[PDB]
Amino acid sequence: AQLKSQIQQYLVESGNYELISNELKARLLQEGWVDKVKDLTKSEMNINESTNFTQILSTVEPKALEMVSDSTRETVLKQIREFLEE
Amino acid sequence: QLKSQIQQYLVESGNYELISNELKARLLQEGWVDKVKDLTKSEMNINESTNFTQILSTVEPKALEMVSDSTRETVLKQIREFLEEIV
Amino acid sequence: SELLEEQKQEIYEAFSLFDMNNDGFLDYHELKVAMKALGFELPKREILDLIDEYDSEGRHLMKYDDFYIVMGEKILKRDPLDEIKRAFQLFDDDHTGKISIKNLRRVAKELGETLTDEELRAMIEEFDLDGDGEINENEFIAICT
Amino acid sequence: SKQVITEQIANDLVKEVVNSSVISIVKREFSEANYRKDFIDTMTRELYDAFLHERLYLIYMDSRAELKRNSTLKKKFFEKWQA
Structure with missing residues (x-):
């Protein structure tokens, strides 16, 4: 099979999936990306406060997923590369 | 708690006057002020005395009711609007 | 001061009747009903102006002595x-x-x-x-x- | 070589962390908003109660004043008549 999942499997079992995630959450917080979302969520709500939780969430997710700088995507790739070569 | 930080600004902004007068003018126009003044006096003809809590308990319940739905909703909103601009 | 003794009673009884906490002073609301107890009804501005005029303290209240002058006058x-x-x-x-x-x-x-x-x-x-x-x-x- | 799989997995991870964050972030702003509204509704109902309480008090004041004026008049002239 493709069996990328095997690599996910080890990534997770070795504790590295979590450590990388935490480090990702760490940098997202440092670089103000969380504030940029705590804001984006307030604009959408200020626009129409009749549109419910679900609709707001949908509007925000794709946008936030794009606010992620490309130097941050990089570090995640680097760290996942390095584990693979082992 | 911080509610006092509000109560204060309510007065120190002149908003307490605005709403109290709007409430008065409306209770007055619809004849609320009158009936209430009558029945309070009326009880008072039992005079000597009786102190405000003993009159309030005997009239407040049947006074809080007779406030026009129209009046009640207008004043509630004006008050609501006030707090929204602060939080 | 040329008030009949009962006129002086009218004034004292009316002030006491709204000196709610016996602090010896009346605030705007109490002053305005006290005056009505003597048959005098005045515009909010009028009444306030009196208070500031006799407000020796800066506390926006009126002491009985001053209430007795202002009232005594209008009663005459x-x-x-x-x-x-x-x-x-x-x-x-x-x-x-x-x-x-x-x-x-x-x-x-x-x-x-x-x-x-x-x-x-x-x-x-x-x-x-x-x-x-x-x-x-x-x-x-x-x-x- | 065949390390486009690296790219796929790095993407899935970032996807999941983000979703995780935005969901709890949105959940916050909403619950925060809902909390303000709860506060306001409560104070609106409380202040309103006060405004009616005061109005009642000033109608209590006004009723004692009127009864006092009238009783002074009835007494003054009833007693003189009775003279």
Whole structure:
């Protein structure tokens, strides 16, 4: 099979999936990306406060997923590369 | 708690006057002020005395009711609007 | 200061009646009802102006001494007739224009007074000439004059 | 070589962390908003109660004043008459 999942499997079992995630959450917080979302969520709500939780969430997710700088995507790739070569 | 930080600004902004007068003018126009003044006096003809809590308990319940739905909703909103601009 | 002793009582009783906490001062609301207890009703601005005028302290309150001056004055310049008529309306709450026995009894009871049914008939008799067993306005006015 | 799989997995991870964050972030702003509204509704109802309480008090004040003026007048002229 493709069996990328095997690599996910080890990534997770070795504790590295979590450590990388935490480090990702760490940098997202440092670089103000969380504030940029705590804001984006307030604009959408200020626009129409009749549109419910679900609709707001949908509007925000794709946008936030794009606010992620490309130097941050990089570090995640680097760290996942390095584990693979082992 | 911080509610006092509000109560204060309510007065120190002149908003307490605005709403109290709007409430008065409306209770007055619809004849609320009158009936209430009558029945309070009326009880008072039992005079000597009786102190405000003993009159309030005997009239407040049947006074809080007779406030026009129209009046009640207008004043509630004006008050609501006030707090929204602060939080 | 040229007020009858009872006039001085009117003033003191009215101030005490709204000195809610015996702090010796009256605030705007209390001042405005105190004045009404003496028959005087004034515009919010008017009343406030008095307070600031006599506000020696800066506390936006009025002390009894000042209340006694402001009041005493307006009481001196009160018209004898208007008082007698306001009274004649108070006596006749059945709005007939004639004071009847049940009226007089109603006032008697009201003021803690204790008078036989016949004291009141004699009261009426004394001045209601003529017709009919009850006092009308210019009858009443005569009495008080 | 065949390390486009690296890219796929790095993407899935970032996807999941983001979703996780935005969901709890949105959940916050909403619950925060809902909390303000709860506060306001409560104070609106409380202040309103006060405004009616005060109005009642000033009608209590006004009733004592009127009864006092009238009783002074009834007494003054009833007693003189009775003279």
